[model samples]
Target: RTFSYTLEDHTKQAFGIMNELRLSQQLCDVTLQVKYQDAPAAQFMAHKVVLASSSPVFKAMFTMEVVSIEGIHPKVMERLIEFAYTASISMGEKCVLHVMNGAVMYQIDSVVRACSDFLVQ
Candidate 1:
């Protein structure tokens, strides 16, 4: 018997695990308390290792307690944290700018470039 796998297969498997991590709060090592002016405060749970590896800003501050942004929505931050682990996300045209801005702000270069590619297409 022989076993073989392509790069795509491994990438897909990694993403599957990352997506599962996003859904399982108990697996998370850190919590992001997101607060906006109008919307209710939201608690976003994720692994510090995933975030720190992807963003220098996150690396500098791993034990972040509360993340309060003036204009960005909690949902967008949720997507950003998910991207840190998974490397991909579905961005609708309406929220493309917001997504791009958040990526840029967080220094997630891969996602910034991805958002640009998404816009070009």
Candidate 2:
């Protein structure tokens, strides 16, 4: 047997929970503190559900308790997190490219697809 079955589309439901967790400030555990080698700010923070949900690599990292990065601009990672949460992104040319690459590195598919859509325009 193919071992396949119908799965309900829960995208909206999931996003609802995510947003509530963010706004109401509850049930969020993992916090990502990112430092950019040459950015204005020293660091930024992110939630695990957002990151791990969007990227399998992130999921593995969190589950395995190993995670780190170097030399990525805070703005870039910020945009990446935004995409991870909302699947929406807007940026200038340079930042767009950076975020796109970051998305690829983290295996965030929506950002990848969005970047591809942006590229063919």
Candidate 3:
């Protein structure tokens, strides 16, 4: 699977993880640092929540508003939710990601469906 990922600051980000170790910030600019915990660090939250055990911050990263779509039909929302739920399950494998996915999937689905409908307008 060939995919282009976003650029990050690994050096700085990893420094925080290895030394600073802050739980307050959800994101750590993966490109800025190189956490010595595991290899997944290169990827997005994949390494943090799953490989490095940073789920608390992972779940905290998502917002209710972000989960709620702005405009779209219920059907589209369904599709989006399906995708989102799948993402939840497939994410960095954090425990909270599962719980958060389940919890937000419902809300997001509703919003997505509504957004799909709105898009129809």
Highest-TM-score candidate: 1
Each model's lDDT comes to 0.77, 0.69, 0.34
Better of 2 and 3 by TM-score: 2
Badly placed stretches (over 4 Å) of model 1 are: 1-15, 63-71, 117-121
lDDT of 2 at 113: 78
User: How does candidate 2 score on lDDT?
Assistant: 0.69
Q: lDDT tens string, model 3, 1-121?
A: 8988765877445544543232333443332122223222221212233222322333454320112222233333333323332332222222323333333444544433444444455
After superposing candidate 3 on the true structure, give the runs of residues whose Cα lies further than 4 Å from its correct spot: 1-69, 87-121
| lDDT score for candidate 1 against the true structure | 0.77
TM-score for each of the candidates:
0.74, 0.70, 0.18
Best by lDDT: 1
Encode model 1's per-residue lDDT on 1-121: one tens digit a residue: 9999668589668767876876876567677877777888888877777788888878887643444455667888888877777766766788887888888888888888888888887
lDDT of 2 by residue, 55-119 (tens): 89878877612234666666777777666767677888656677778888788877877887787
Model 3: lowest-lDDT 10 consecutive positions: 63-72
